[PDB]
């Protein structure tokens, strides 16, 4: 019974809105931001 209750309660804590999976969100965030900087910087005169 204790095992079943704990397995049940895992899902609620995961579903709580705090950043439980921030460690996996940061990967997509870093990638998207790096590519976006690369494209946005293609519009600079650099002294031209």
């Amino acid at each position: 019974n204790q095992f079943n209750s704990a397995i049940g309660k895992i899902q609620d804590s995961l579903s709580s809105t705090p950043s439980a999976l921030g460690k996996l969100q940061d990967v997509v965030n870093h990638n998207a931001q790096a590519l976006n900087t690369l494209v946005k910087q293609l519009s600079s005169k650099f002294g031209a």
Binding site: V39, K40, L42, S43
Partner: protein
């Protein structure tokens, strides 16, 4: 193509954007032309 002074290659298609009367060629994030009002027939095209 060479619209009015631009140059380069692309595929000119129909568009759905709406340009104000003063509002002649659109632009994108990296600051490159990607729309244009064709001079004679005042259509709006998309350059890709």
């Amino acid at each position: 193509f060479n619209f009015n002074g631009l140059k380069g290659t692309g595929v000119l298609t129909e568009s759905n954007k709406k340009f104000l009367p003063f509002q002649q060629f659109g632009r994108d994030i990296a600051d490159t032309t990607d729309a244009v009002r064709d001079p004679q027939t005042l259509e709006i095209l998309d350059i890709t």
